[PDB]
């Protein structure tokens, strides 16, 4: 029990509203003058926190009773539940497969006399995901202690279910912040294709340039021809306009819809900038907004159980709801960051084939994909680090394996940026497994 | 924990630093004197003639009334009425703050 | 109103000794009394209205 | 600070409404914008802007973001026009239907 | 404008402790320092800084 | 057929997010402090 608690518990009034209606002499409160019970609504119309007991007016000994009991059913969805994929009952690892395009090869019926059976290998890039999140939620409900707050089994069992829903709400809160982390993860790894801007809040116009760099990017992602320019594997892929999502801060999206007048009447369009999924800000310091694909989130469910326990001594239950999930992103599936302020000039060097089984004495053409923020050409130092047996690469990325290597070597594509005083060696890296051949030789010409 | 009986001899207030003395066949307790190292901390009001107990246990930290504003990491000693106050004289330090406290608020402390 | 809770990591080793831990829900309340009691009235003197 | 003070101040007042009406509808909810400090959440059909008519038509003419979306319910709440509040400086109340 | 205090209503055993959370409604974007205090007609029973 | 390989292969970590949430005292990674399995998601959540 409690006593001595007034209706002013935690309330710091700016002006007393009941003097103002009392002292109103042609003032702006003058329409509250003809209200009959004005002084009663002002006392407990803000709600009562502690529940004082109230005697009845006619018969003082009777106590006015609690009438309706409202149990709030407020739900907390994930904003990104539409990006979550199916369920995986068994296994742990997911395997992506993307088969890229090939070249054109002019029809020539004289070259066809010998080039039957020509062995062109398809260009498949694979990508692996494993289960990451593994956590549980926890409510205790004391059933018999809650039978004193509830006079009907409707209101009692409705409140029990509102504790289960708070578990279900707690899942889609943390599933949000996990999926929000993967954007903060992927940009911290340097796997976004960044698009440098000025700080949009610095001026109008700087806003208007930012809507240009989003509307231009969005059409570039949804070009049907596709491009190797907008994912961190640099295969040639497209997106769709309905499946493109602009994940943006609430404050930044507020600026664009009012100031940049073109975006204003293009709200309730799904195709001006894709589907704008307003969230709050990103934990990364520069990341202003992100266009992203529907196939970006490789988010899968593994386990949704609510196992229960009952303590007989305590006369309660424990409700243990387990949520197991794969929470990773596809390095396919076009994804664009929009980053203000200071950026590196080059953010990523994507080395094609990043995985190679190359024969002893064989060769393999590698290609770098320098993702620069500015419009500048950048020199790729190809290297072979690792190995022990004198293998070397050419200046354009043709590997040449030294015939008796017998050691795993990794192939790096270095793009030095910055100046020579602090050389910022942005390095992309492939790997090569050296297969034996049992070949003769040792010197040429 | 190891409990034993002790008698207050001077209006013990909760969350105050306590000292003790040898009394009439019993350990008597009271608020620790200013500028020293306390032995026990109150966690119940026990009046001048009241008899109570002490629960012995190597506690990592105590929660006591701040005798003045305290900054995180401040070395603390006894102050007026057995409250904890900031200092700089090692010989009177009994612990240090791990959290901010304003005068009259509780401050968690770690013993040294 | 029943608010939301926190996530605990799946640890099967820690799960040996504390299946019977109890989490009190973060439930809060408000109370709304009857504020207003009024009437107002008009006469209809309808035989003279004819 | 004051919407009627300049035409450039009206654009700021609408950027504070579009910002706030989005945070009130975030599906993950928010502790803020609330007196019991619980992570609650509105819909956009559940939001309601209670504003004075003098301020209201002032926004519909000048802020052209609002002039297109004058006949919609998703830019702001269902705009409830009243004759105005009695407290000094109170201009608009963005509020839920469960309020 | 408003300082909001977590678990505005608490039932605490005489050997125990309850966490109390301040929630500040700051108009300006300033992280204002919250001073905790406890008042009650008996003796002892203090709050830490956090 | 591969020997020792990392999860960071072509990864240019402009900042480490694990050390960013660990060293966080309210600098915008405060939303990840009550996040339970954060380190294992950010470890292999880049595919």
Helix (H), strand (E), coil (C) string for A383-431: EEEECCCCCEECCCCEEECCCCCCCCEEEEEEEEECCCCCCEEEEEEEE
Helices (H) and strands (E) in chain A, counts: 6, 20
Q: Taking Cα atoms as reference points, which of B77, B81, F17 lies closest to residue A185?
A: F17
Q: Report d(CA A137, CA D92) in Å as an integer.
A: 40
Q: Which residues contact A70 (CB under 8 A, 6 or more apart)?
A: none
Q: Report d(CA B81, CA B17) in Å as an integer.
A: 8
Residue A380: alpha-carbon gap to chain centroid: 32
Q: Which residue of chain D has the CA closest to A49?
A: D36
Q: Report d(CA A20, CA A18) in Å as an integer.
A: 5
The answer to whether the CB atoms of B14 and E15 lie below 8 A apart is no
Task: Kindly provide the resolution of this structure in angstroms, with one decimal.
Answer: 3.2
Q: Report d(CA C19, CA C42) in Å as an integer.
A: 69
The experimental method behind these coordinates is cryo-EM
Give the position of tokens 């270095």: A414
- Looking at beta carbons, which pairs linking A372-377 to residues 24 or more positions away fall under 8 Å? A372/A345, A372/A346, A372/A347, A373/A194, A373/A195, A373/A196, A373/A343, A373/A344, A373/A345, A373/A346, A373/A347, A374/A196, A374/A345, A376/A345
Axis-axis angle for helices A206-221, A250-258 (nearest 10): 100
Q: Any CB–CB contact under 8 A between F12 and chain A? A: yes
SS3 labels along E1-50 = CEEEECCCCCCCCCCCCCCCCEEEECCCCCCCCCCCCCCCCCCCCCCCCC
- With contact defined as 3+ CB pairs under 8 Å, the chains touching C are A, D, F
What does DSSP say about strands A244-248 and A275-278: parallel, antiparallel, or unpaired?
parallel
Q: Taking Cα atoms as reference points, which of A229, A77, A97, A253 lies closest to residue A168?
A: A77
- Tell me the CA end-to-end span of chain B in Å, nearest whole number: 20
The answer to whether the CB atoms of A188 and F12 lie below 8 A apart is no
Q: Which residue of chain C has the CA closest to F38?
A: C9
Which positions 21-80 of D are in contact with E (Cβ < 8 Å)? 31, 35-37
Q: Report d(CA A361, CA A384) in Å as an integer.
A: 15
Cβ count within 10 A of residue A265 = 15
Cα angle at A355 between A350 and A361, to 5 degrees?
Answer: 115
The answer to whether the CB atoms of A49 and E4 lie below 8 A apart is no
- With contact defined as 3+ CB pairs under 8 Å, the chains touching F are A, C
Q: Is A436 helix (H, G, I), strand (E, B) or coil?
A: coil
Chain A residues touching E8 at Cβ < 8 A: 9-10, 49
Run of H or E including B6: strand B2-8
The answer to whether the CB atoms of A135 and C21 lie below 8 A apart is no
For residues A369 and A228, the answer to whether their CB atoms sit within 8 Å is: yes
Give the position of tokens 């279900």: A168
| E runs forming strands in A173-261 | 196-197, 244-248
Q: Is A211 helix (H, G, I), strand (E, B) or coil?
A: helix
For residues A243 and A293, the answer to whether their CB atoms sit within 8 Å is: yes
Q: Taking Cα atoms as reference points, which of A396, A397, A337, A340 lies closest to residue A371?
A: A337
Q: HSE (CB half, 13 Å, CA atoms) of A281?
A: 14
| E runs forming strands in A330-397 | 336-340, 346-351, 357-359, 363-365, 368-372, 381-386, 392-393
Q: Taking Cα atoms as reference points, which of E37, F10, F33 lies closest to residue A232?
A: F10
Strand partners, A276: A246
How far does C13 lie from chain A, in Å, by closest CA?
Answer: 14
Chain A residues touching D68 at Cβ < 8 A: 264-265
Q: Which residues contact A406 (CB under 8 A, 6 or more apart)?
A: A360, A389, A434, A436
How far is the CA of A368 from the CAs of A186, A364, A414, A433, in angstroms? 20, 13, 9, 19
Q: Any CB–CB contact under 8 A between A375 and chain C? A: no
For residues B95 and B76, the answer to whether their CB atoms sit within 8 Å is: yes
Q: Taking Cα atoms as reference points, which of B64, B97, B69 lies closest to residue B83?
A: B64
For residues B94 and B111, the answer to whether their CB atoms sit within 8 Å is: yes
Q: Report d(CA A227, CA A246) in Å as an integer.
A: 19
Residue A49: alpha-carbon gap to chain centroid: 39
How far does D16 lie from chain A, in Å, by closest CA?
Answer: 8
């Amino acid at each position: 029990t409690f006593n001595d608690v007034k209706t002013s518990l935690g309330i710091t009034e700016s002006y007393d509203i009941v003097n103002a209606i009392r002292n109103s002499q042609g003032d702006n409160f003058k329409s509250y003058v003809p209200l009959a019970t004005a002084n009663n609504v002002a006392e407990v119309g803000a709600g009562i926190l502690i529940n004082q007991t109230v005697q009845n007016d006619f018969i003082t000994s009777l106590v006015d009773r609690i009438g309706l009991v409202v149990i709030r059913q407020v739900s907390l969805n994930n904003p990104l539940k539409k990006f979550k994929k199916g369920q995986i009952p068994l296994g742990r690892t997911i395997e992506e497969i993307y088969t890229d395009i090939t070249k054109e090869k002019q029809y020539d019926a004289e070259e066809a006399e010998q080039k039957v059976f020509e062995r062109e290998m398809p260009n498949v890039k694979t990508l692996f995901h494993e289960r990451n999140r593994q956590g549980f939620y926890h409510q205790t409900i004391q059933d018999d202690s809650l039978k004193t707050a509830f006079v009907s089994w409707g209101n009692f069992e409705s409140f029990v279910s509102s504790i289960i829903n708070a578990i279900y709400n707690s899942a889609e809160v943390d599933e949000y912040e996990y999926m929000k982390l993967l954007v903060d993860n992927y940009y911290s790894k340097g796997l976004f294709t960044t698009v440098k801007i000025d700080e949009p809040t610095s001026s109008t116009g700087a806003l208007t340039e930012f809507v240009k760099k989003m509307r231009a990017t969005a059409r570039k992602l949804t070009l049907p021809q596709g491009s190797r320019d907008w994912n961190s594997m640099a295969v040639r892929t497209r997106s769709y306009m309905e499946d493109l999502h602009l994940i943006i801060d609430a404050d930044l999206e507020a600026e664009l819809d009012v100031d940049v007048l073109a975006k204003a009447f293009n709200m309730n369009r799904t195709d001006f900038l894709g589907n704008v999924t307003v969230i709050d800000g990103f934990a990364s310091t520069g990341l202003e907004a992100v266009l992203v694909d529907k196939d970006w989130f490789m988010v899968y469910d593994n386990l949704h159980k609510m196992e229960t326990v009952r303590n007989p001594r305590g006369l309660y239950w424990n409700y243990y709801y387990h949520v197991w999930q794969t929470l990773s992103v596809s390095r396919f599936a076009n994804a664009v960051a929009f980053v203000s302020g200071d950026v590196p000039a080059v953010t990523q060097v994507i080395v094609s084939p990043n995985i190679a089984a190359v024969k002893q004495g064989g060769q393999q053409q590698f290609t770098a994909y320098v993702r620069a923020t500015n419009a500048k050409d950048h020199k790729v130092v190809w290297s072979v680090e690792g190995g022990s047996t004198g293998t070397a690469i050419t200046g354009d990325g043709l590997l040449s394996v030294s015939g008796n290597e017998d050691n795993q070597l990794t192939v790096k594509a270095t793009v030095d940026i910055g100046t020579e005083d602090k050389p910022k060696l942005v390095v992309g890296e492939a790997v090569v497994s050296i297969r034996p051949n049992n070949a003769s030789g040792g010197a040429q010409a | 924990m190891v409990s034993f009986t002790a008698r207050a001899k001077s209006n013990v207030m909760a969350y105050r630093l306590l000292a003790y003395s040898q009394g009439d066949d019993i350990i008597e307790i009271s608020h620790a004197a200013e500028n020293t190292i306390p032995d026990y901390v109150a966690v119940k009001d026990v009046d001048k003639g009241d008899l109570t107990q002490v629960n012995m246990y190597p506690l990592a930290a105590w929660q006591v009334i701040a005798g003045s504003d305290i900054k995180v990491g401040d070395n603390l000693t006894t102050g007026k009425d057995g409250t904890a106050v900031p200092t700089d004289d090692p010989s009177t330090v009994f612990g240090y703050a791990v959290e901010e406290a304003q005068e009259g608020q509780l401050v968690t402390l770690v013993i040294s």
